[PDB]
Design an enzyme around this catalytic site. Structure first.
Site, short mmCIF file in Angstrom:
data_model
loop_
_atom_site.label_atom_id
_atom_site.label_comp_id
_atom_site.label_asym_id
_atom_site.label_seq_id
_atom_site.Cartn_x
_atom_site.Cartn_y
_atom_site.Cartn_z
CG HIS A 77 -11.78 94.76 30.60
ND1 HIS A 77 -12.93 94.55 30.01
CD2 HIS A 77 -11.56 96.13 30.53
CE1 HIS A 77 -13.44 95.67 29.57
NE2 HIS A 77 -12.59 96.62 29.89
CB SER A 108 -14.97 98.84 30.55
OG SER A 108 -14.33 98.74 29.29
N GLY A 109 -17.65 97.34 31.57
CA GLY A 109 -18.33 96.76 32.72
C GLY A 109 -19.79 97.13 32.84
CG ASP A 162 -14.20 91.39 29.82
OD1 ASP A 162 -13.84 91.49 30.97
OD2 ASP A 162 -14.24 92.38 29.11
N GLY A 166 -14.13 103.89 29.60
CA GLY A 166 -14.77 104.32 30.82
C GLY A 166 -16.17 103.70 30.92
#
Ligand SMILES: NCCCCc1ccccc1
Ligand SMILES: [Ca+2]
Length: 223
Positions: free
Chosen positions: A40, A177-178, A84, A175
């Protein structure tokens, strides 16, 4: 990250910042040429920033390397956020040292009760906004499957785990995320989603990296 602590400059040496003119997602360095992040977070025109602590100040340990290829998981579903995860290849190989280092992939899935380190430059408020410029850290346990499925009825797949605190106050946030969830020196999760941040009975949900190890290996062996 809400309710965490300042990590300290370059104490999480596998942490990367994905930048498209601004920081928008975290990520993890898994060898000198490849980064894993959340699908995402996909964008065209990604520059990978390694060796970062303050992302608004050039401090001396940074390596800014543009991405040459991004590979989103073949079964990523953006509606359910199942699978994801994505891989990013760097145009050139990073120079590895004590401050820029890769993190190992798991050979085993981690169990509920395992304490882990979650890190990122995301929002530090559960209500309202304040973005740090330096890396924030949070130690959180992996929660059991059944408390995770009870918190998010009908939304948790086998490629997801929950981690955090059922009574809230401490969580990853936007922020982040990942970014990495590292448990016993292995990358076990990727900051994926949740219902708001640090809310009661709404813990963070993370992509379960141990399910993806052979797709990762096979894909980097071929690209
Ligand atoms: N609770 C999970 C924390 C994951 C990140 C997050 C940020 C903003 C909105 C939802 C989830
Ligand atoms: Ca910097």
């Amino acid at each position: 990250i809400v309710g965490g602590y300042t990590c300290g400059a370059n104490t999480v040496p596998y942490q990367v910042s994905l930048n498209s003119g601004y920081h928008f997602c975290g990520g993890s360095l898994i060898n000198s040429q490849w980064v894993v992040s959340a699908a995402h977070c996909y964008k065209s025109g990604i520059q990978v920033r390694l060796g970062e602590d303050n992302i608004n100040v050039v401090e001396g340990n940074e390596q800014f390397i543009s991405a040459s290829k991004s590979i989103v998981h073949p079964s990523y579903n953006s509606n359910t956020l199942n699978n994801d995860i994505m891989l990013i290849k760097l145009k050139s190989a990073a120079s590895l040292n004590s401050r820029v280092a890769s993190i190992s992939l798991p050979t085993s899935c981690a169990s509920a009760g395992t304490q882990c380190l979650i890190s990122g430059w995301g929002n530090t408020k559960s209500s309202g906004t304040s973005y740090p410029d330096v890396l924030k850290c949070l130690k959180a346990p992996i929660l059991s499957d059944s408390s995770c499925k009870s918190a998010y009825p009908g939304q948790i797949t086998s490629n997801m785990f929950c981690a955090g605190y059922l009574e809230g106050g401490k969580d990853s946030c936007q922020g982040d995320s990942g970014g990495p969830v590292v448990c016993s020196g292995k990358l076990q999760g990727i900051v994926s989603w949740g219902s708001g941040c640090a809310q009661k009975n709404k813990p963070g949900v993370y992509t379960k990296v141990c399910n993806y190890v052979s797709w990762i290996k096979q894909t980097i062996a071929s690209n």
